[PDB]
Structure formats: C-alpha cells, structure tokens
Chains A and B, each alone.
With several copies, the nearest count.
Chain A
C-alpha cells in the first residue's frame, strides 16, 4: 500500500489515498525488513521534486522532510554530493551509475529517389543523342539500317536480339568503342551509387560534453532537465556551462515523464542524467538513443537521519547481499526483461517507391508499345 496524493497534487491538493507501490526498491526494503525486524508505512513526497536549499535557504521536498523529523529513512534512487553529505549519513551505494543523454531515435530513411538522378538528366539525354548519332554514322560507314538501331540500343542494354552484324569493315572495327563505352558507363553508375551510399547519419551530434552546439546553445537544438535536481547542483558548481545552464532554465521541468513524452512527441530533442532509468526507458521503448560519456560517477545508496543507531547495521546487510549475488538476482528479475533491436544504426533499404517509379515506367512503356504497335499495324 502507498499513501499518496489523489490527483498527485500538482496544484489542486486532493487529499491522500492508498495506492499500490511496487518495484525494485520495494523488494529491497522488504529484504531489509526480513533482515532488520522493523515495520512501517509508506508515503509519497509532497512536491514531486527531490529538493535543494534554495532561497534564508531551505531544502525542498524529501530532503527537508527527513531533516525535520517526520521521516526517518529515505530509500529511493538518490544521488550523492557534498551538500547532502554535510548533514546526514548514508552507507555504501547499492547501484553505481552515472549520466547520459537520450534523443528521439531517428529512422534509417533510405534515399533512392535518385532512381535516375545520380549521373544527371542532361547525361541521360545526351547518351540517347550519342547512341542515335553513332548508329546512323555506322550505317553510312557501311556503304540493314531500319533495324540497326536495335544493334546499338541492345549493346548498351545488353539485350541480345542481334538480328545481324556490320558487314563493312569500318563499323566492324568501330563497334568496339561502343562496347567499351557501355561497359564503363554501367561501371560508373555502380561506382557513384556505391559512393553516394556512404553518407552516414550523425546521431550523437553532441560529443560527450565538449560539443559547442551544446557547450554554447543554439535555438536549433532544444534541451532541458528537471528543476531543482542534483544535476543543477552539478552544473552550477561547474561554472563553465553556466550559460547553457542558464539557458536550460528556459526549458526545465518538474517530472521525468514530462521530458519522456516531450522527446516522444519529437519536440524536445534530449533528456538527461537519470541514466539508470534511461536504460529501462530505452530497452522498453526502442524509439530512443542514449549517448555521451559518463559524466558524474556516483551511486545510489540509502540515506538515514543524522547518526541514527542504524547506520552501522545497514551497510552490513548490503555487502552481505552483494556477496551472495542476491543483488544480481534482483537485477535479472527487474532489469534484463526489457529488450528491443540494439545492433546499431544499420544501413539498408527496401524502398517500394524508388523502384515503383521505374515500375510505373514499365507500365507506361506498355501502353506506348500498344500505341506504336498499332501505329505500325495501320502503317504496314
């Protein structure tokens, strides 16, 4: 059971209500129950925000809540810093972790609408000009013409209808260059296609943290985090990105699911820093991408009030639990059960449209054949 705000009280503080709370940490707490011999209730925080000693100053939410006395043990994913360290104690962390940045995964989006472009249209026309002219020129070089067009047409196209052959010696030498021209032309086409298929898709356009587009913000890229989070502490203690830091205050939030759906609706381009949650978000959503280098090596452990008699004991269990691998069992229980495609940004194409264009060319040539054929019928 879970005594929490009815409408979650983000402004209209509907009174509390028993809900159902359950997850990894709950498992942890019940283990610590079986090993520590205590009983308890459970409740939510007043605000939906971790807390910080903002301006006299005072800590929002759970921090100040514990500090008062109305609380006596704080178990949740909790970061570690110096500020919180100044007042309370907490044992070794139970899950090491860091920071990363997530972006709405892009689609491969093959580009083959060049189905006749990658040389030119100008080339596509001058080649037909050249074929006609060299055809009739070979004809004159003979002295088998009305169909000699078939000859060069096919030898470009590798048809093999070959109704005849040049009887004169002149063209009987000439045709070689035409053959080589066809060979090198198709070679060229293949080569430029292969090259044009090297243009990669730069996804993690931000390099770790030193990317200036994210080291100096551009209006083309939107970005934020959750307000009053420890991440803000980390930034404002590192004055460098202050601008971006200042900049990001134009976009901050109050909940993680906020930024979650924000990047889901493709407006917000990046969410951050809840790494050990971004993993589940990704491997259960498979429309998002993590990246960056790990920023702030820290760990989630359990905090308790100042110098309670419990500290010395708690740690023990944890290591005991880290000994028998029970931790890893909980991992397999609540962690690995999410999976989607994870190979890489794979290059491929099955483009129905870029070949549907040429299939329509097929169908059009069909009616062209009907028309021209009956034209020749009436002719003969």
Chain B
C-alpha cells in the first residue's frame, strides 16, 4: 500500500471537474 492508487484520488479530480464546469457556467454571464 506504499504507492497510492490513481483511483484512490477520486474526489480530487471530482471537485476539479466540478469547479471547471461551474467556472464555464458562470463565465457565460
């Protein structure tokens, strides 16, 4: 279990993409 799993970072890029989408959505305005 020394090296972490790429899958064992889900929420990381979850929130990443979420922020990116919210960014584009608001920047429409």
Known: A117-B3, A119-B4, A184-B12. A173 touches B20 (CB 8 A): no
Query: Which B residues are CB-close (under 8 A) to A174?
Result: 19-20, 23
Residue pair B23, A173 in contact (C-beta under 8 Å): yes
Whether B16 sits at the interface, judged by CB under 8 Å, is: yes
Tell me the residues in window 117-149 of chain A with beta carbons closer than 8 Å to chain B beta carbons. Answer: 117-123, 126, 130, 134, 137, 141
Residue pair A120, B3 in contact (C-beta under 8 Å): yes
Q: Binary interface profile of B, 1-28, with partner A (CB < 8 Å = 1, else 0)?
A: 1111110010011011001100110110
- Min CB gap A67→B, angstroms: 64
Query: Which A residues are CB-close (under 8 A) to B15?
Result: 177, 180-181
Residue pair A196, B23 in contact (C-beta under 8 Å): no
> How many residues on chain B are close to A (CB under 8 Å)?
17
Residue pair B2, A114 in contact (C-beta under 8 Å): yes
Known: A123-B9, A130-B16. A170 touches B26 (CB 8 A): yes
Please classify the interface of chain A as helix (H, G, I), strand (E, B), loop, or mixed, using the class held by over half of its residues: helix
Tell me the residues in window 166-196 of chain A with beta carbons closer than 8 Å to chain B beta carbons. Answer: 168-171, 173-174, 176-177, 180-181, 184-185, 188, 192, 195-196
- Min CB gap B27→A, angstroms: 4
Query: Which B residues are CB-close (under 8 A) to A120?
Result: 3-6
Residue pair B19, A188 in contact (C-beta under 8 Å): no
Residue pair B6, A177 in contact (C-beta under 8 Å): no
- Min CB gap A197→B, angstroms: 11
Query: Which A residues are CB-close (under 8 A) to B19?
Result: 174, 176-177
Query: Which A residues are CB-close (under 8 A) to B6?
Result: 120, 122-123, 126
Residue pair A170, B27 in contact (C-beta under 8 Å): yes
The chain B residue sitting closest to A120, CB to CB, is: B3
Tell me the residues in window 336-360 of chain A with beta carbons closer than 8 Å to chain B beta carbons. Answer: none
- Min CB gap A266→B, angstroms: 27
Query: Which B residues are CB-close (under 8 A) to A177?
Result: 15-16, 19
Residue pair B4, A134 in contact (C-beta under 8 Å): no
Residue pair B27, A141 in contact (C-beta under 8 Å): yes
Query: Which A residues are CB-close (under 8 A) to B26?
Result: 169-170, 173
The chain A residue sitting closest to B25, CB to CB, is: A170
Query: Which A residues are CB-close (under 8 A) to B4?
Result: 118-120, 123, 188, 192
- B residues in contact (CB < 8 Å) with A: 1-6, 9, 12-13, 15-16, 19-20, 23-24, 26-27
Can you give 25 A-B contacts (C-beta < 8 A)?
A: A118-B2, A119-B3, A120-B3, A120-B4, A120-B6, A123-B4, A123-B6, A123-B9, A134-B16, A134-B20, A137-B20, A137-B23, A141-B24, A169-B27, A170-B23, A170-B26, A173-B26, A177-B15, A180-B15, A181-B12, A181-B15, A181-B16, A185-B12, A188-B4, A195-B1
